[PDB]
Write a protein that binds this ligand. Structure first.
Ligand SMILES: NC(=O)C1=CN([C@@H]2O[C@H](COP(=O)(O)OP(=O)(O)OC[C@H]3O[C@@H](n4cnc5c(N)ncnc54)[C@H](OP(=O)(O)O)[C@@H]3O)[C@@H](O)[C@H]2O)C=CC1
Ligand SMILES: NC(=O)C1=CN([C@@H]2O[C@H](COP(=O)(O)OP(=O)(O)OC[C@H]3O[C@@H](n4cnc5c(N)ncnc54)[C@H](OP(=O)(O)O)[C@@H]3O)[C@@H](O)[C@H]2O)C=CC1
Lengths: 328, 328
């Protein structure tokens, strides 16, 4: 049939390393953490060569088990895959520890990309039933987030740079950030040495993020789009214009919402636990400038930020109140 | 601006190795062999990751020198590149020798793809001014091509398999063929062991080669399209519908004649010595099923086979009479 599939497209990071434009997202519900394994296996067999995970997801062990099985049966080699993981704000000042923990969970010797997950620092609160004996997102009795006082979010990135630049340390192939604003990127660029290869952020037709895209392009940073379907229940499939363009280019809604990013040179990581959904939705709809313009217009007009949890409220672009339901 | 660029697309061979869909062709005029070096350097800086060459082109040393310079100044690593070369019919029964000669000329330890250039065997005629002391295409006093009588073209492919399957031999990563008909591929599949990863053939809107495409797809072989612009003088840019579709998708004629193949899952290797032409023509026109249909209609209606030299005449698909000028 017709090519490229979205599994066949590769963008270049600013250190010359290639990344598959399309990745599998694995921030799956706590109730279904084990189902990640089959989703990853299904993704790779359908041609995905990029898996996105994180220390905070609790899915690393299941991504690792899927990879181990495909390695062992000869379906894939390690060098064929691109694995991304992230350092959570609770370990903002212990990056070495986070990476080693992620490596142990994944059953891997290296990751391709290591991200600072948030420009945030959390206090370390003990919980034996938490991740690595720690509360994920600590709050006090009032219900507000416990940030590390005198914690600098840029300390995380500095620790990333050290590991990335150590010539006898082979644990990462690239570093980056997630949920950084233009202002935070500017501070990083001023104060740090290594240009982040990616800034991973929420974006899609309901949040086109034009300014950030422009900025990152100007400064040699690729966007990775998270929650491209709008997270729980994939509300972005129910946008009329999406349904319309999907129809024209003979693709599924998932395909179109994937292609919206890849067309603009944005890496994209839709999440699914559904093997047949993962497998089918690998078609490319090569949107016109004008069609992109329409899609972007829509998001300007009806902005919805689905990922805006309370812990993020202290950051300029975030409210902590979650999505504006009215714009749906 | 818009993605993918044709430099960003990768297809998968039947042994799991990825190949960039777009390659630089290097069958340059004997008068301009040296200019290949700058063309390869320009291709790679523009993002090409695939170079196509051959023992018979006399351009291997210049491809090698280009690569060596980009390796030395740190613009590329060897593992980033895909290099194809071929065994010419004069060495049909000396593949080890041809490979080693190619490796020496290229200044390389391995190639990614090694192809049988033609389903043909030539007599070895000495000429000190020829390639490796031999006449490239021997013709007798009557002007007839000197084929090795009692030479079986499939001996060449058998010698390819031996090297490809030797586990202590790392000189190749894939083997294939070029200029094979369906009948020849069928005989190969019946009598051999390794399925060719590619069959490299002339194809483009003036020679759609629908039947071969269908066959290779059914049998797990990718097509690589050679002479996609119609060879000397790039006559294929002058086709009206090609000029029309280029206009619509806002790309150049080269882009469109490139996109024609990539869209159908065909690897393509346009040749140029022009640095600005190579650099600009990396856009993708994602042709509709219908537009493909139109282009294919045109070639079925107006077949022109531009590569059809006398030596090829004994092969049932070829005439030896060169292109039918009438169909232009
Ligand atoms: N850097 C960061 O701070 C963040 C990063 N991310 C990353 O990005 C990834 C993607 O984002 P995510 O937040 O998961 O949300 P997505 O936009 O990818 O949406 C995922 C949901 O859509 C559903 N869905 C998919 N296809 C369909 C369909 N055809 N019909 C109906 N429902 C469908 C899926 O359910 P189903 O399984 O049944 O198909 C899934 O629950 C994450 O997994 C994570 O890796 C996410 C959030 C924050
Ligand atoms: N397997 C086999 O038996 C064969 C394989 N091949 C392979 O395929 C490659 C490509 O095929 P090839 O035969 O070279 O022919 P092509 O179809 O690629 O055409 C090449 C010619 O087109 C010209 N050209 C490119 N762009 C333009 C333009 N915009 N305007 C005008 N002219 C243009 C080039 O000149 P310029 O440099 O000035 O731009 C060049 O002379 C070969 O180099 C070789 O690697 C080729 C023949 C046989």
């Amino acid at each position: 049939m017709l090519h490229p599939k979205t599994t066949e497209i590769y963008f270049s990071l600013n250190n010359g390393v290639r990344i598959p434009a399309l990745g599998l997202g694995t921030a799956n519900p706590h109730e279904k953490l084990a189902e990640t394994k089959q989703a990853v296996k299904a993704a790779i067999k359908a041609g995905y060569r990029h898996i996105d995970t994180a220390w905070a997801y609790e899915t690393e062990p299941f991504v690792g088990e899927a990879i181990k099985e495909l390695l062992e049966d000869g379906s894939i080699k390690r060098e064929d895959l691109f694995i991304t993981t992230k350092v959570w704000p609770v370990l903002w000042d212990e990056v070495d520890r986070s990476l080693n923990e992620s490596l142990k969970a994944l059953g891997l010797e290296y990751v391709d990309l290591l991200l600072q997950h948030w420009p945030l620092c959390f206090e370390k609160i003990k919980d034996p039933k938490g991740i690595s004996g720690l509360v994920k997102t600590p709050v006090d009795d009032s219900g507000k987030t416990m940030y590390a006082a005198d914690g600098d979010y840029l300390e995380t990135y500095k620790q990333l740079e050290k590991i990335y630049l150590d010539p006898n340390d082979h644990r990462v192939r690239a570093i980056g950030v997630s949920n950084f604003s233009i202002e935070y990127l500017e501070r990083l660029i001023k104060e740090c040495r290594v240009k982040p290869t990616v800034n991973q952020v929420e974006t899609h037709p309901h949040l086109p993020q034009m300014e950030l895209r422009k900025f990152c392009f100007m400064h040699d940073i690729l966007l990775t789009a998270y929650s491209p379907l709008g997270s729980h229940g994939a509300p972005n499939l129910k946008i009329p214009l999406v349904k319309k363009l999907a129809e024209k280019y003979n693709v599924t809604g998932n395909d179109l919402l994937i292609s919206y990013h890849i067309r603009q040179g944005t890496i994209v990581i839709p999440r699914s636990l559904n093997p047949v959904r993962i497998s089918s939705s690998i078609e490319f709809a090569s949107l016109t400038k004008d069609e992109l313009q329409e899609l972007n217009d829509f998001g300007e007009k009806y902005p919805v930020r689905f990922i805006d949890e309370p812990f993020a409220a202290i950051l300029p672009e975030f409210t902590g109140n979650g999505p504006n339901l009215d714009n749906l």
